[PDB]
Amino acid sequence: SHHWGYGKHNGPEHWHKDFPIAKGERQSPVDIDTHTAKYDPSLKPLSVSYDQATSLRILNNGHAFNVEFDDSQDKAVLKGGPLDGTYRLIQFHFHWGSLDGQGSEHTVDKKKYAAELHLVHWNTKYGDFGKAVQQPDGLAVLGIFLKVGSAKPGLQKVVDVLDSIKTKGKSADFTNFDPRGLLPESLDYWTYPGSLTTPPLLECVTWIVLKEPISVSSEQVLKFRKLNFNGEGEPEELMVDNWRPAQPLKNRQIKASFK
Ligand SMILES: O=N[O-]
Numbered sequence: 001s002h003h004w005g006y007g008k009h010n011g012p013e014h015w016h017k018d019f020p021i022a023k024g025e026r027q028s029p030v031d032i033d034t035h036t037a038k039y040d041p042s043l044k045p046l047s048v049s050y051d052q053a054t055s056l057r058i059l060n061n062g063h064a065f066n067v068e069f070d071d072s073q074d075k076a077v078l079k080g081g082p083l084d085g086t087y088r089l090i091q092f093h094f095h096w097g098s099l100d101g102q103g104s105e106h107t108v109d110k111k112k113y114a115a116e117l118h119l120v121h122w123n124t125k126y127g128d129f130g131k132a133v134q135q136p137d138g139l140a141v142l143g144i145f146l147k148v149g150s151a152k153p154g155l156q157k158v159v160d161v162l163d164s165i166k167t168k169g170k171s172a173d174f175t176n177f178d179p180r181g182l183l184p185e186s187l188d189y190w191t192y193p194g195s196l197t198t199p200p201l202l203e204c205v206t207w208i209v210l211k212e213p214i215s216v217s218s219e220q221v222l223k224f225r226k227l228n229f230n231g232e233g234e235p236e237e238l239m240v241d242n243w244r245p246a247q248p249l250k251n252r253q254i255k256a257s258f259k
Pocket residue numbers: 118141195196197198
């Protein structure tokens with residue numbers, strides 16, 4: 001509730017105290033050195049099957065907002081790419097900055113983007129998300145960078161509900177949202193084994209990071225920056241800079257799906 005966040009006193013440099021895996025061997029995010037990632041011809045195209053996605057709700061959970069999905073059947077699934085089996089979409093959320101020069105979690109040759117989107121999926125062979133996060137191949141997260149330029153139409157429905165979930169713990173019905181509207185044109189990706197980027201930082205994630213950023217407008221990101229980390233009736237702290245910086249790559253190889 002205040003033991004981890006992104007403030008001066010509970011930010012990413014502090015998380016290892018409650019979550020020692022923060023200094024682990026497969027932590028995320030990382031800097032993607034484009035000259036050192038190796039093309040792997042064995043990597044298959046990613047299969048994003050979001051046609052039957054059922055969004056249910058949007059929740060300000062105090063660190064970001066999550067758009068949640070019905071995951072009791074195979075409705076919105078990620079397959080292929082580096083993955084074995086079927087991974088069901090459970091939620092997506094973003095990380096963003098106070099200024100356009102920062103906000104993403106992953107970086108590319110040290111470049112920081114203005115924000116980053118994460119679509120979170122779990123492996124169905126484990127039956128539920130809570131069991132899946134306990135497995136090294138339990139989750140697959142699709143990461144997408146945001147830059148400031150032209151507006152992203154498929155984001156505006158998210159932007160316009162944010163006034164109704166300004167503060168922590170507020171939720172709003174959020175049915176019939178189509179996550180395909182947040183994807184860039186190309187599904188070229190880098191992939192590496194990593195972790196959740198918020199506590200509990202479990203090392204259960206196959207990361208799939210798209211090379212092509214999406215563009216959003218200055219006004220859209222300005223509305224993200226009006227959210228609050230705090231609950232209603234508490235001192236206003238703008239929800240900005242909710243990103244973990246790049247972590248050591250250690251004994252990992254980032255593979256590229258492209259030449
Ligand atoms: O928030 N990333 O798992």
